[PDB]
Amino acid sequence: SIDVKYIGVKSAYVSYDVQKRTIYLNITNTLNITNNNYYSVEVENITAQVQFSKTVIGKARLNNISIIGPLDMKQIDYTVPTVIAEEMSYMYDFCTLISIKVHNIVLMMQVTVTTTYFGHSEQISQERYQYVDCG
Amino acid sequence: SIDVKYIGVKSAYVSYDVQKRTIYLNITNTLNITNNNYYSVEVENITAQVQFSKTVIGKARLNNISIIGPLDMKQIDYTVPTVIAEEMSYMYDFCTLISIKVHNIVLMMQVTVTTTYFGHSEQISQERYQYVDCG
Amino acid sequence: SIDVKYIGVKSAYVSYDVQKRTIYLNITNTLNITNNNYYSVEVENITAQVQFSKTVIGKARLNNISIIGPLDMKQIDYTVPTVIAEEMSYMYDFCTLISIKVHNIVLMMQVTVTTTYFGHSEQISQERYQYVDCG
Amino acid sequence: SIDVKYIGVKSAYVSYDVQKRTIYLNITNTLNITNNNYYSVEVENITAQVQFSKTVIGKARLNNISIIGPLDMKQIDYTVPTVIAEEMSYMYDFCTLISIKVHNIVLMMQVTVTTTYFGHSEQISQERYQYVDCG
């Protein structure tokens, strides 16, 4: 990666930005830029590359063979009861969240039993997150 | 990746942006830019590449063979009861969320039993997220 | 990827944007740009590439063989009862959400039992997300 | 990908945009642009490419063989009862959502038992999402 960046408000190369109650007067701004960029990125020079896989099974006796991959979930219970009994009563609820198994972002890449891989793999996340606001 | 960026409000190369209660007066802005960019990115020079797979099964006796891939979910229970009993009562609910198994973004890539792979793989997420707002 | 970007409000190369209660007066803006861009991206020079697969089964005896792929879901229960009993009572509900299994974006790519792959694979998500607003 | 971007409000190359209660007076804006762009993208120079698949089955005895692909769903139950009993009572509901299995965007690509693939594959999502608003 090159130049992965989180900027909260503002980006510039060059900035003369003015705000609020300003007297900006008799100004000379003179700017001579020479900004050149040369990226040579993820450049391969390969003569041979081989990804060979071979499985021989002879005069074998295989039995009861179980290959289970990743992220197996079995026998999982969420029990979240709510009861509200009221006699002769005043209830006031505001901004009340029951949240179960609540995801924002899920990135999965190369999630396997077997993997042969050759090259570049990349995950980038950039974010402002706010779960709850209440005034 | 090159130049992956999260900017909250504003981006410029060059900015003379003015705001609010300003007197901007007798100004000379002079700007000479030479900004050149040269990207050579993900450039392959390959003579040979081979992805060979071979499976031989001889005079074998295979039995009860189970290959289960990733993200298997089995026997999963969400029990979320709500009961509201009221006698002679005043209830006031505002901004009340029961959220079960609530996803925003799911990216899946190369999610497998077996994978042979040659090259570039990439996931990028950029976001403002806000789950709840209530005033 | 090159130049993947989330800008919250505004982008410019060059900006002289003015706002609100401004006196912008006797201004000389002079701008000489030379901005050139040269992309050489995902460029392949390959003489040979082979994706060979071979499966031989000899004088074999295969029995009870089960290959299950990814994201298998079995025996899953969502029990979300709501009961509201009221005698002699005043109920007031506002902005009440029961959300079960609520997705925004699902991207799936190369989700398999077996995969041979050669090249570039990519997922990009960019978004403003807001689940609930209520004033 | 090149130049994948989310801009919340406005984009320009060059901007002199003015707003609100402005006196914009005696202005000279002079702009000399030379902005050239050269894209060489996803360019293949391949002499040979082969995608060979071969399946031989000899004097074999295959029995009870089950290949199940991805995203199998079996025995899934959503039980979401609502009961509202009222005697001698005042109910007021506003902005009440029961949402079950509610999707926005689903992109699926190369979702398979077997796949041989050669080249570029891509998914891009860009969006403003708002589930609920109520004032």
Distance between start and end Cα atoms, chain A: 40
Counting DSSP H helices and E strands in chain C, the numbers are 0, 11
> CA separation (Å) from C24 to A30, C20, D14, D19, D28?
19, 11, 18, 12, 12
Query: From the CA atom positions of chain A, what is the Rg in Å?
Result: 30
> CA separation (Å) from C98 to A2, A123, B86?
43, 33, 21
Total of domains in chain B: 1
Place of tokens 């199940």: D68
Evaluate whether A107 touches B107 at the Cβ level (below 8 Å). Answer: yes
Query: Which residues, 6+ apart, have CB-to-CB distance to C96 below 8 Å?
Result: B93, B96, B97, D93, D95, D96, D97
Residue B18 lies in a domain: no
The strand pair at C114-133 and D114-133 is best described as parallel
Amino acid occupying residue B102: V
Q: Which residues pair with C20 in a beta bridge?
A: none
Residue-level length of chain B: 135
> CA separation (Å) from C40 to B40, C2, C76, D112?
5, 11, 49, 32
C26: which chain D residues are within 8 Å (Cβ-Cβ)?
A: 25-26
B98: which chain A residues are within 8 Å (Cβ-Cβ)?
A: 98
**Residue of chain B with shortest Cα separation from D74:** B74
Query: From the CA atom positions of chain D, what is the Rg in Å?
Result: 30
Cβ neighbours around A110 below 10 Å, total:
15
Cβ neighbours around C87 below 10 Å, total:
15
Q: Which residues of B98-116 are buried (b: 16+ CB within 10 A; e: fewer)?
A: bbbbbbbbbbbbbbbbbbb
DSSP three-state, residue A71: coil
Shortest CB distance from D70 goes to which of C84, C92, C112? C112
Q: Which domain holds residue B94?
A: 74-100
Q: Which of A116, D92, A64, A107 is nearest to C108 (CA)?
A: A107
Evaluate whether B34 touches A32 at the Cβ level (below 8 Å). Answer: no
Residue A91 lies in a domain: yes
Strands in A73-79's sheet, in edge-to-edge order, are A73-79, B73-79, C73-79, D73-79
Interchain CB distance below 8 Å, C101 and D101: yes
CA-to-CA distance for D14 and B13, rounded, in angstroms?
10
Place of tokens 């506002």: C94
CA-to-CA distance for D102 and A133, rounded, in angstroms?
24
Residue B49 lies in a domain: no
Amino acid occupying residue B90: Y
B81 touches chain D (CB under 8 A): no
Residue A96 lies in a domain: yes
Evaluate whether C103 touches D99 at the Cβ level (below 8 Å). Answer: no
Residue C87 lies in a domain: yes
For this entry, resolution in Å reads 2.6
CA-to-CA distance for C133 and B20, rounded, in angstroms?
29
Task: Name the experimental technique.
Answer: cryo-EM
HEC profile of chain D:
CECCEEECCEECCEECCECCCCEEEEEEEEEEEECCEEEEEEEEEEEEEEEEEEEEECCCEEEEEEEECCCCEEEEEEECCEEEEEECCEEEEEEEEEEECCEEEEEEEEECCEEEEEEEEEEEEEEEEEEEECC
Place of tokens 């979910």: B73
Evaluate whether B62 touches C63 at the Cβ level (below 8 Å). Answer: yes
Q: What count of CB pairs under 8 Å joins B to C?
A: 494
> CA separation (Å) from D103 to A90, A92, B31, C39, D57?
38, 33, 50, 37, 43
DSSP three-state, residue B38: strand
Instruction: Output phi, psi for B57, to 5 deg.
Output: -125, 120
Shortest CB distance from D6 goes to which of B57, B69, B126? B126
